[model samples]
Target: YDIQAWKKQCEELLNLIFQCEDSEPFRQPVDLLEYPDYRDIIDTPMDFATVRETLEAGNYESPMELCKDVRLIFSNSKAYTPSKRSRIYSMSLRLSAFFEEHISSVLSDYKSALRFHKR
Candidate 1:
C-alpha cells in the first residue's frame, strides 16, 4: 500500500502547490538571465516543474525524498532572498507552511489506511 495512496496524495499535494498563486516563481527553473548569481548561492536547483518531472518518472525511492525536494525549493528561495518581506521570501513561507500542514494530513490519512492494511 505504500506505493499507492501515499504517492497519489503526493501527486495531489504537488498539484495543490502548483494551483497556489504564490507558486508562480517556482513553477519552473530559475533562469540565469533572471538571477545571474543564483546558482552561485544555491547548490541544488529544485522547482515545481522538476518535481512533477521526477514524480512522473518515478525517480524517487520514497515520498520522503520528494518532500525533501519540495522543502528545498522554498528553503533555497528563503536563503537566497535578502528581504523577508519580498515576494519570493513570503511566497516561500506561505507555500512551505501550506505544504507542512497538508502533508501531515496526507500522512495521517496514510497511517489510518496503514492500520487497515495490517489485515
Candidate 2:
C-alpha cells in the first residue's frame, strides 16, 4: 500500500520534472525532489517516517506548523540559496510532503471502497 502511494507520488514528481525547463535552474516545483541538500536538511527517511506516524496517529497539525521545523532546519544549517529558489523549494517540499501523506490515506480508502464494491 505504501509502495503504491509512493509510486503515484513519484509519478507526479516525474511529470512535474518533465514539464519544467532543464537548461537553467529557475526554481521549478519539482526541483524540491532533486534538491541536492534535501536529504541533508531532512537528513533521513526516518524523519519522513516520523511525520507519517504522527499524522497516522491522528495528530493533525497545520501545514505551516508542520513545515516550521523544516524551515528552521534549513535556516540553522545555513542552507540558504537565492531568495526565489529558497521560497520555491521550501514551498514545494512542504506541499509535496503534504500530498504524500494524503496519498497513503487515499489509497487505503480506495482499496476499502473497492472491496465494498466487490461485496
All candidates: TM-score = 0.85, 0.28
Q: Score candidate 1 by TM-score against the native.
A: 0.85
The digit string of per-residue lDDT tens for model 1 on 1-119 reads 45367777889888988999989989999887789888788899999999989988989766667889998998888778988768888888888889899888666666676777886
Query: Which whole-number lDDT from 0 to 100 does residue 101 have in model 2?
Result: 51
What does the lDDT read for residue 109 in candidate 2? 50
Which candidate tops lDDT?
1
The list of candidate 1 runs beyond 4 A from truth reads 1-3, 108-119
Taken over the whole model, the C-alpha lDDT of each candidate is: 0.84, 0.41
Clashing pairs in 2: none
Model 1 scores worst on lDDT over the 10 consecutive residues at 105-114
**What is the Å distance of residue 44 in model 1 from its true position?**
0.5
